[PDB]
Design a binder for this molecule. Sequence first.
Ligand SMILES: O=C(O)CNC(=O)C(=O)O
Ligand SMILES: [Mg+2]
Ligand code: NI
Ligand SMILES: [Zn+2]
Length: 331
Amino acid sequence: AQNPNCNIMIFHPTKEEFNDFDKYIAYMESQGAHRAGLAKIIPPKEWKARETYDNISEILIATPLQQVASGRAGVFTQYHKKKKAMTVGEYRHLANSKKYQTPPHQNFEDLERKYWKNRIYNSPIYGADISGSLFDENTKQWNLGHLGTIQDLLEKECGVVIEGVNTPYLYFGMWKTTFAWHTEDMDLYSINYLHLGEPKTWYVVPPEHGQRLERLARELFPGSSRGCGAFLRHKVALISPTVLKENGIPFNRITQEAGEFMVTFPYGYHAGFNHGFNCAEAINFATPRWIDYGKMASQCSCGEARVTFSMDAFVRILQPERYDLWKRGQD
Ligand SMILES: O=C(O)CNC(=O)C(=O)O
Ligand SMILES: [Mg+2]
Ligand code: NI
Ligand SMILES: [Zn+2]
């Protein structure tokens, strides 16, 4: 069995290997990359996402989200308070202000220590989930707006044509902006490209151990767990690496830098934080190996998780027994 300790693997494809996206994902899986839940892909030196980032300041962040924490430093939830619209140039200036800027630090490990010590005492503002793309249309390799769609994959594998679309999303971050513990909708893959700026630190639980994280989360968030049998779908709970280690939960960590891709694999729980002002692009995707995970994915039906239009068909076709209850949660 390849990668039996479920370590995060880092890949350096050549320009020739960067042509065929599906083939390279399958290659990484042949080497055991999925067992970690997360892999890093460093593009060949010949590749670029676009020519420059000098002209992005006028993108609008219609609904910036202030991430307010509750709990203790290592075990907390966050809620998202909506703020007034602002441009990317306005948000960059805000991120660099004395109130929000990255503190002085020695290295990524020092900054990580500072994040976990102090995150709860601040409320950073995240420009998340903005439909759009920063890949140039002429970038032919690993262009996250030109991937095979999940609807087409389901149709290819299972024969059923379904409605829905699959487009990327932009994320503008600042110091301490946080992504809570989650797997993807319908336990899909995700791919995330860090276009510019400061790093993003990731934590991940191997897919084979995801239920250990779920059991800990039910213990640590007992009111939330009574409210919903899949409350991590709400994307609000944080647990620190120190608490995971105290409770014996297997996990790994890695820092993504500008110019790097990360892939999350089906049922790979992940969480993390941004080091400072940055911009990432991410999208969900599927392969043949995903279908069995999609069929088994948990679902939130309490009403909180509320998701995209295109999840309806995935539930309807892959999980017909759960469909009626899930759709009630959507309405
Ligand atoms: O970058 C973020 O805030 C969150 N990203 C992801 O969870 C992802 O790419 O799957
Ligand atoms: Mg612009
Ligand atoms: Ni994710
Ligand atoms: Zn729920």
